[PDB]
Amino acid sequence: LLTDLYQATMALGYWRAGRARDAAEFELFFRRCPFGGAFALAAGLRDCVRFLRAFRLRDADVQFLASVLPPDTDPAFFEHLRALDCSEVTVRALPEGSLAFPGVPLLQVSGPLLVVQLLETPLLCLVSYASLVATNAARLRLIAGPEKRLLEMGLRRAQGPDGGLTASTYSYLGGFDSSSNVLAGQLRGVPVAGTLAHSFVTSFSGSEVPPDPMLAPAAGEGPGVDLAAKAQVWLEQVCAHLGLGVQEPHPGERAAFVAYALAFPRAFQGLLDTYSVWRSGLPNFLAVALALGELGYRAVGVRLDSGDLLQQAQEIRKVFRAAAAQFQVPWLESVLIVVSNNIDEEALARLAQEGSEVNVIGISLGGVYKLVAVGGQPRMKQTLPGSKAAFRLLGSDGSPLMDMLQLAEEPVPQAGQELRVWPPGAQEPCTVRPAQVEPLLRLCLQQGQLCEPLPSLAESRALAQLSLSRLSPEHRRLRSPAQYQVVLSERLQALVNSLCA
Amino acid sequence: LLTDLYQATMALGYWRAGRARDAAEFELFFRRCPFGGAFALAAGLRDCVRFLRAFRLRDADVQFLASVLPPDTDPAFFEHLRALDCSEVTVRALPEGSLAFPGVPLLQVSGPLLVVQLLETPLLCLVSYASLVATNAARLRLIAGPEKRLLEMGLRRAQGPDGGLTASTYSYLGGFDSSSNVLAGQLRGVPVAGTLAHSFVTSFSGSEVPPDPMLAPAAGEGPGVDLAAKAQVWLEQVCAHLGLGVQEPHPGERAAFVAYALAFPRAFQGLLDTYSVWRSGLPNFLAVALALGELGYRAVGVRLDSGDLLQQAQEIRKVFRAAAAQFQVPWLESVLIVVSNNIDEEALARLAQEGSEVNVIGISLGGVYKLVAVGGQPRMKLTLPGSKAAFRLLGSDGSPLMDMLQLAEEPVPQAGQELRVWPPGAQEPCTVRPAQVEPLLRLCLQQGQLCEPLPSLAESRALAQLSLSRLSPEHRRLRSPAQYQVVLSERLQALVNSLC
């Protein structure tokens, strides 16, 4: 994944001109207030580093490039492209989970010019996307607010060949509790749920079959029950309890329920929606819930996709008040009510509220990779020169005030106070006295060898939840938040003025 | 507070000699490998800070003093004493749950000599005891290894007043799952659990009382049924099933269970071993857990203290298995099994696990506070001088290699490379390139006012568990672990030499 012609013409541009092995620093930051949010939260590195570690250039990829390029280029030092990197590259990176504000770096990348140049395209791919998914998952968690396991990704279908993965991965980071996706489960141990599908239900006519209809008893012992037969018997009792034709529940629906039940009898879930909740789905669920519970036992949830979810949520639990008084079955009412589809926001907020009988709810940044210094001399042209250190200044209450950029040479922190040139009011400086002064970009990789082990998602995820909880109300506002200062050291501001502002 | 004479004595000393407002810095650190491990958990920041208001005044303590006994005494200037405030005091701290190694400060306290000296005593107690509790719970969570409902404190004595509260809080931080302490529940939100008691069971004759023996059906309205009657009906069936006389399982026990279960129908649990487990506790549990249940309630729990617990537990599940089938009652299989009365930590290792059947298990530092500077002018005795900064060299499997020490003036290190003279260790410098370099002590209080909000015990507890995972295997070692090296800057070593 060198993938585009300009990468290679620029590569050979630099090779031909003596600059391929020149020391360059680059920085990836962004500009857009993302979703009209104040922050991104930061994600990508996971994938970044797996990539750098399969710089994959087959001799047949390269032979091809020589086809498209001038004959005889250079002495056929295409060799360079086969020697790649190995690595003289260096990365500092915001930890995933960290909050990220416009016009502060998230990566800084350092190395041979020709190489670190190649990475513009892939690093954006990864970071921009990862961060957008996380950041949104964060805003949904903000709307829902934090209670049980409420919040369920997915149900819905890939970008691409395989990358369902990443949606899943970084929604977890943002705050969702589990996921339908099994790639993310296997790799990264996202919790996996989400079992139900309309396409199962509608594949059944009615015409049930006994290759084996018999459900083993929950306990142990030979003969169980012809589970199908019994559920009919329970269906009489329910329709009686409900004022219904026994003729009325769709027997397709019943078969599929039964069919699910034989395979997952400890985890029997019920999709209420396919035809009619009230006159089909629900009666059939109970018929079948209650046939279990003698033998294979204790059903486990139901699902809705349409209508006023909140009104059906609330009516569904309702009269179990007497729909389990009537049959005496302790557990029915504490069955889970899962809802999905047409949710987005408010329903979202009120289904996360009130007294709501729902338990589980299914479901641009301006990213920029810029050279800031080559040959340890700075480089400028609205984006700031030279190789920088970055630092979040926090208030007494825990919450960030402002990020501060300064030179790599400079001394560092502390918890006494600073002059400091804000980039609006850039006529004279503040003095500011921060409670804490935590640095931002940590060393991920030096000379191609990792300088840190990689967090679990659960670490990364906890850091996010932490960072958001500590972030100011005014900066967490979904629309029209307060601004957030980035601001400059004196010696930076002076380099900016040196390099004719 | 100030609790012994010589504290007040030596205060008066400083006053009298014009030294009471002299700017001192002190270092609290520890000397000893506790339980013979290599590390401690830093703990007890929560209490030092609440406390620095509860110092509080009172004047009648100052009046008892003053029979300090020089009557005599300075223009009645005990007013300083009633004036005292722990402002001008500035602290830096390891955060909670960070590992700590002997050699390296846990706090620095700076301020007026007379003031910051007086706090030697409070801070020594609070920090020593909290860190000793957390470290112990770490050592035991290591030995239990890490599962889901498992590990449990543990109360028959800790202290008297505050010590229930702290022992529990800091066991939760070292990574117990929960506590029996209600006081810790209430303030610091520590899960609360553990419920039964031999004495409750021994209190029943088996002349049982029906003021109400009606349990309620758990479905929804309708009359409640007499639970004791039904336990009895069901007793005949369990003893048949088990091959015992209906007579052997003890009546008063059964009373006590039924009594519990009337109070706790959804969370019924069973102490098995008051009398016999096999001939009594267990039959009586099964009799109730079935009667209860025939009303739609589920049993939750059983408990052993005594016996060979690893074994009783596997035999028990056999029969829970045999009865869930026989009686058609499947929850009975995953009824939990709680054990208690080891405290000893070889026992723990048997019990956790093995494919052990148990679910839940019920259940000093060389500490120093030393003056390093007065009048920005260092002090050394012949322990380590000057105001310092401290730093932990890592990595790149994340595991620490050494803590390093440093003048407070010096630049901060990063992830190139470093010349540093050890302790043995004034022969010749090491050279080291840290992967990462964490600075350990962080400002939590400046000039009376706190410069950061307190982490939560979820936050502290996860950092502890975290920090322990990254530790190399040689420091995690319970018996005979490797000595963690602590080491000096050139400039710090250069100050130590003068005079030796």
Numbering used by the authors:
A (entry chain B): 16 to 378, 390 to 407, 415 to 534
B (entry chain A): 16 to 378, 390 to 408, 416 to 533
Text lifted from the article:
Nicotinic acid phosphoribosyltransferase (EC 2.4.2.11) (NaPRTase) is the rate-limiting enzyme in the three-step Preiss–Handler pathway for the biosynthesis of NAD.
Here, we report the crystal structure of human NaPRTase that was solved by molecular replacement at a resolution of 2.9 Å in its ligand-free form. Human NaPRTase monomer folds into 17 α-helices, 24 β-strands and the connecting loops organized in two domains: a first domain characterized by an irregular α/β barrel and a second open-faced sandwich domain. The irregular α/β barrel domain (residues 160–378) contains a six-stranded α/β core (β6, β7, β11, β12, β13, and α6, α11, α12, α13, α14) that identifies hNaPRTase as a member of the type II Phosphoribosyltransferases (PRTases) subfamily. The crystal structure of hNaPRTase reveals the presence of an intimately associated dimer in the asymmetric unit with 3000 Å2 of the surface area buried at the dimer interface. The resulting structural arrangement sterically prevents the binding of FK866 to hNaPRTase due to severe clashes between the inhibitor and the protein region defining the tunnel.
